[PDB]
Design a protein around this ligand. Structure first.
Ligand SMILES: CCCC[C@H](N)C(=O)O
Ligand SMILES: CCCC[C@H](N)C(=O)O
Ligand SMILES: CCCC[C@H](N)C(=O)O
Ligand SMILES: CCCC[C@H](N)C(=O)O
Lengths: 400, 400, 400, 400
């Protein structure tokens, strides 16, 4: 490293996203080199053995660690305010590696009712198949978590804003509940916010997981994830969760593209939220739109909590139309600028129907209990000029 | 696809490794394009829903599937003689995703006593922590597997040659034992051999796992894996093991580099084994070397089985010196051509001490039971001229 | 996907993301990296038709590649030109265009203040091949008209241009170039980008760029572009690049420029926002003798900067109240500003030509070229302006 | 890691893997991809010293890059030259070397049979810039000596060369070039590679390559090299590439060539092994009128092929007992041989110049250039020779 985290404390977010974690190499390359290698050479046989026993620093194998990935891990941990970070080949790889490491057969988990489709599948149809009981509750009211707590509850998993409806959860209050019992941790999926908007570790969370694929990469060309938290737990996830349980190690090439994307994280998040506030206001005033969910609108139920724990309201807008699923299909198909695709946190504005697409693993009974309407549309607002996004949505909504 | 697997049946190995699985795209690029994307665009909202319900072919998200990865999966399945394949971000990702999918709490596994370090850790300290009993046996004698079989044994995991000592296991006889019980499968780790040398599916295995990092990539710059088997099981590993349990999805860039490496798989394996037969004979005749384990030497215990199930003897040579660990260190450090590093299946000849390096998770009690000597040296013979590899080893061994 | 006619009414950011992009058979959101050398023909007739220019399609990457085509169409749409052709460097674009447009016996009227290597290519390159070149102070357009000759086939200008960032009225120079029948105006729009300045609309025939700088924006690709009429761009593609220079761009590098262009509007806005703040600070600072920046009211050509540039840019040249020793002290004292050549990157780059670039030059030679003892060129990055200003203050306060 | 002196006694494969490689601070086995545009100086003095050539180090990727340096040293070691400089294309290497070595008023004696674009660069390029070029039948060296003039500063040759793969005795032409004081011999060693032919040892001053072909070997990188004395290579780096052409190679493309070179010996051996088998088959086949291949005893310059080439190469030109229509039928009938231009790839490429490359040319123009109605150039790949021969047999049997 060149910029120490002590020097980085007084620096701004954009400055840290560019210079923090970066290492001054022998050639002095401005860009972090792509150390696209599988194995590393030891100077002596004794060095190799010391490296395996944790007695000497250095690299051994890319699944264990790589210098391109180290710069990215150090950079993410500095922004989130965590001791250490470990990158994975996907957002689900980060979620699974952390939960496989922190849990064992006989443990209990209190998870939020509204979660990302595959996360719900991993908890309901994955961890339950391996002798781990999971209780899903409406996390908006923290008292439901307190009620579902048990003497064997070793972890609490939350996601705020919840994908897709954007239901918020007070992190600081849930951390107080998690820390009431001796052996219990709070895992927060900070994919939607990024450390620019929200930092759950500072609010009380022990572990923070991300789907780097979305806003941290920002260019929709890398499937990746991160696990941020205390060094003691991150070393366990690196040498057990990824090394043995999942095998979800990130490629040095993909890690370089995330480093490249992070250089513009502050300016991308500012434009993303600037456009989303303008699009959400337009949707709220439009006749064809029945209800708009966005933390920036005064009509949002948890508007006071959005101001308290989020720097900006985000880029995602969930909304319901004055019509069934047929009306929603007509809007999606009429779009010429808004791209009809899955995923979020990209320069292209993406749009989709969560009932049949993202939250498809959820059965219709579980879907409606969480709050997914047959006709809800989730909009991931991109970096295009808000004038063109609004014009495209207007010509599509005016037809219905 | 351009070359159908019916046309590919009569073609040779090198021809299949170059043309099989390749798709003729709209531009007609000779090289497979690197579709470095995270999400894919649907032509209509109905198309998206049909794609998620499995009613229409096409792509949705790179974690689920990608066209660069599809060409590689089709190519590997054709060479191995399997119905389908699914790529992962690491060799351990392929092992874990297949075992997480095939097993549940209450199941039993009969695993080989000599296995790769992290595989042993995933079975002994991973699956056991999640209510799955595992019995390790000397798989060289198949009767030990038959004795360890139980009414709940849903899988048998084997690796032949076993890393590092190179102990062989008759696949056809173990498959007959696995198929005696209704719900039991045989998983074979064909990393060392590759489908050019050994094809366990044809011998009887249900599932074949690989660590693409080693000989299939061949250039030591990609950490990757594969799960080959019946389409029914491969779809379950793709949409459950990788999608939810591990998150070990392969990057399209890394997948392209494996496709690039496969173009020379036949010529690399031939040179690798050509040099290894010459190095092993030299080591056997050298005074300082006590015992050499290599399937090509007539001194090998399972020499008849090596001829029956392997096309060539491979590139790995395990050997013991007429001296302790100090003598082995002196040999490793004296090397100028043989690179002192971990991993195998690369142009550079790699050399290491398994006791302190690869099989370090094994405790000294478990290590000696499997057959790992304090002083054993595993040599991954590269593609350099055998004259220079032998000359380098001679000047190092003559000093002791 | 998005036709040039539909893109006309769209904003800059929207065009930089969606214009030029092609909807492929798989529907990848990101443009695929067609990393290939040659392309396959469906029949022998198809190959012949493509070589005769009768049928559309690809033949070889040096001639053309689909990743590069998307980038070329995108750049031509933003600049308002008919066609574009990418090169492996900024100098490759400059040389390929001039080698194509000129022959032995022709004359060129070039600006006196140009990029170091451009001046070398004109003074030592084209003169060595029977091409006379007259260098003039292009700020006053009357000097260009005086240096015009009956054989002047081209006029090369760069605005702004080092050392003091002087400007050239493009519309006035185009009127001079078009007074003679066979004469063109080539403008190096590297500093401005089509977001700030579009010389084709003002009158220029050809526009060259060094994509390495602001168009890529991440300092990891050496690349260039030649924009102009299709008739001349086809000649540069099939003669200048194909035969004279061989400066063809890699599809991988082309993809990274496409990735960088997704945030061009937001990067240029932040770059100029920070530069206006840094320039005002430097002007008010005691240790700074003079500041050259098109945004300050003290700038000589302030009216022309507002007339032909949307924003004043990101480059700031400034004189110190001190010699070469003071300039060395300031640069070495920097802890945020990076000591490196080049411009248009997230990292703020700082250079002192007297002690770094023009160091072989003697003091007499330096002053003839226009490099003073305390001249410092600053390429303002995307970090928070408060941290850039704080770093410059602690360095400049030491020399008071 | 491996010095040029230690590499002297090592074999070709060993040098192609270990020579030129640099032991970096992390000890990565694979050469890192230093994908950067600019490099950071530790002090203002360091930057100045590097610009004055007094201190070693990097400044900008167009000038030099560490990934490219490892590749340049590796190529120069194999060719037996003092220094090498990489370019973004084969034509970039040819043009940069000729632009550097020549000036207006100089004369060049070039071979009559050369690569299409090389002939265009000499006949239409250099002649347009006051450089006279005389083309002669280089098979008889007396024609070169007759075309020599007091201003002949260079002689350009290519051996073997299309259409009929004619050879040129390098050692005899070097004696002619060195008879005059200021004259050099440039040899295009694309077809042979330093494994088959090393023109510097035979007498050549400069050796140019199109790395796209056999050195890369995987048909995914357009690149070139200029090998020769350090004095001339420094001039080509800091004048030919830096200013005249701008043909600098990308670090990513340079890495892929390094990856491809790891298997150069084994690829060239298989390429020539298959080509000798295919050429013998074609010679004995009834529908084939004549076969040009340096390995057949029917070859005119068979003694010279054994004298200056280790192996006869992978390219086979052959005449059919039929016109253009028969040649079209044969190519369209192929199911394994790929219809594409270029050479030196795992896929066997087949081309019929009469109906594909020289299709704009009329029949009278085709015969003057040397392209007959039934001439077919075949770049033999790495597939099994039995499948290549079987594919050619079913295509040639249809035209009997
Ligand atoms: C099911 C994979 C696609 C889901 C996507 N990650 C989203 O949340 O939009
Ligand atoms: C522990 C990671 C390195 C082990 C390496 N995969 C080998 O088998 O040699
Ligand atoms: C080769 C000199 C590099 C100078 C650098 N391109 C600049 O903009 O200052
Ligand atoms: C631009 C023409 C391409 C021809 C190709 N390089 C060949 O070797 O035939």
């Amino acid at each position: 490293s060149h910029m120490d985290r002590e020097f980085a404390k007084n620096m701004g977010f954009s400055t840290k996203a560019i210079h923090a974690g970066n290492h001054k190499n022998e050639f002095g390359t401005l860009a972090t080199p792509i150390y696209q290698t599988a194995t590393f050479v030891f100077d002596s046989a004794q060095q190799g053995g010391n490296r395996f026993a944790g007695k000497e620093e250095g690299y051994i194998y890319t699944r264990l660690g790589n210098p391109t990935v180290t710069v990215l891990e150090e950079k993410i941990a500095i922004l989130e305010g965590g001791e250490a970070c470990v990158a994975t080949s996907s957002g689900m790889g980060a979620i699974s590696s952390a939960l496989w490491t922190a849990l064992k057969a006989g443990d209990h988990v209190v998870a939020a009712d509204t979660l990302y489709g595959c996360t719900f599948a991993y908890l309901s149809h994955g961890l339950t198949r391996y002798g781990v009981e999971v209780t899903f509750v409406d996390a908006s009211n923290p008292e439901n978590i307190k009620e579902a707590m048990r003497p064997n509850t070793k972890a609490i998993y939350i996601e705020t804003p919840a994908n897709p409806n954007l239901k918020l959860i007070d992190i600081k209050k849930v951390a107080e509940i998690a820390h009431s019992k001796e052996d219990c941790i709070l895992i927060v999926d900070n994919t939607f916010c990024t450390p620019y908007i929200q930092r759950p570790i500072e609010l009380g969370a022990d572990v923070v997981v991300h789907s780097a694929t979305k806003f941290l990469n920002g260019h929709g060309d890398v499937i990746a994830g991160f696990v941020v938290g205390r060094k003691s737990f991150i070393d366990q996830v690196r040498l057990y969760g990824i090394k043995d349980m999942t095998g979800a190690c990130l490629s040095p090439f993909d890690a370089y593209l995330i480093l490249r994307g992070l250089k513009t994280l502050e300016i991308r998040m500012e434009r993303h939220c600037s456009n989303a506030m303008k699009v959400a206001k337009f949707l709220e005033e439009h006749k064809a739109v029945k209800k708009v969910y966005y933390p920036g609108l005064e009509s949002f139920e948890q508007y006071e909590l959005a101001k308290e724990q989020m720097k900006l309201p985000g880029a995602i807008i969930a909304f319901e139309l004055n019509g069934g699923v047929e009306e929603g299909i007509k809007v999606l198909n009429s779009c010429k600028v808004c791209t009809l695709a899955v995923s979020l946190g990209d320069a292209e504005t993406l749009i989709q129907h969560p009932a049949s697409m993202t939250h498809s693993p959820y059965t219709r009974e579980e879907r409606l209990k969480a709050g997914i309407s047959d006709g809800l549309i989730r909009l991931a607002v991109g970096l295009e000029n808000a004038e063109d996004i609004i014009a495209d949505l207007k010509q599509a909504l005016d037809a219905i």
